From Swiss-Prot:
One of its GO terms (cellular component) is extracellular exosome. Activated by X-ray, histamine, L-adrenaline, L- and D-phenylalanine, L- and D-histidine, L-His-OMe and beta-Ala-His (carnosine). The lineage of its organism: Eukaryota, Metazoa, Chordata, Craniata, Vertebrata. Changing residue 60 to G: Impaired activity, not rescued by 4-methylimidazole (4-MI). Changing residue 194 to D/E: Strongly reduced activity, but enhanced zinc affinity. This is Carbonic anhydrase 2.
Length: 255
């Protein structure tokens, strides 16, 4: 699978039949229909003691991996039960600044989407968490081009070194708190991973305030390549699945 016209999203169903599932992601959020539910707790994001390891180009995105050992970077609260521990984050962007995000709000697309992916400790690991409908909790955060985000700056400057499918940069001591918005209100719906295997195990929490990145910072994401060392240059852009059928399903709102 990949994101091309021949191995892209419209073909994922041949190999991961679940792509045609009851609760696939992304979806588009129509606000003039999400349900404000007076019972969603706030967010208890405690990223005090979050330890990053490496950032890597895996040929569909770049991700940054964290050390998920004691209950140190954890997401609690929200629609969640248990401690969700942090494994990595995903970043989706477009071939231009008006496409890139996976979730749309009232059909509007942002310039990018960041995903911090966490797994439920009650299942002992990432491995055994994904076969369960309550196994992962993912905060999706939208990016709009505005003034720069100082916290994203270290991410945009190391990208020179993970340019091609397969390179890895060492990247310790990055603080995921410098990527978050001011407000933590959100919309939550149950869904899948947006990438193959496309497993329906995710309670998604999308944040309503985006974060401003300057177009110089978004342009750095666009210098990266899908292709591996050697082979002809396939620029890594538009690494996003389109919005999928909601299936009645309701998106609830904290606000």
């Amino acid at each position: 699978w990949g994101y091309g016209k021949h191995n892209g999203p419209e073909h994922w169903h041949k190999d991961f039949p679940i792509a045609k599932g009851e609760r696939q992601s992304p979806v588009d959020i129509d606000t003039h229909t999400a349900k404000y539910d007076p019972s969603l707790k706030p967010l208890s994001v405690s990223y005090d003691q979050a330890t990053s390891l490496r950032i890597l180009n895996n040929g569909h995105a770049f991700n940054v991996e964290f050390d998920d050992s004691q209950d140190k970077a954890v997401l609690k609260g929200g629609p969640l039960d248990g401690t969700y521990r942090l494994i990595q984050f995903c970043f989706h962007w477009g071939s231009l600044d008006g496409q890139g995000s996976e979730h749309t709000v009232d059909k509007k697309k942002y310039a990018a989407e960041l995903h911090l992916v966490h797994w439920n400790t009650k299942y002992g690991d990432f491995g055994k968490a994904v076969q369960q409908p309550d196994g992962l909790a993912v905060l999706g955060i939208f990016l709009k081009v505005g003034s720069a985000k100082p916290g994203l700056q270290k991410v945009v400057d190391v990208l020179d070194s993970i340019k091609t499918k397969g390179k890895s940069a060492d990247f310790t001591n990055f603080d995921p708190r410098g990527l978050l918005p001011e407000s933590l209100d959100y919309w939550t719906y149950p869904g899948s991973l947006t990438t193959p295997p496309l497993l329906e195990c995710v309670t998604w929490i999308v944040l309503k305030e985006p974060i401003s990145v300057s177009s110089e910072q978004v342009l750095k994401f666009r210098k990266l390549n899908f292709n591996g060392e050697g082979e002809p240059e396939e620029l890594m852009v538009d690494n996003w699945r389109p919005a999928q059928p909601l299936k009645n399903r309701q998106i609830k709102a904290s606000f």
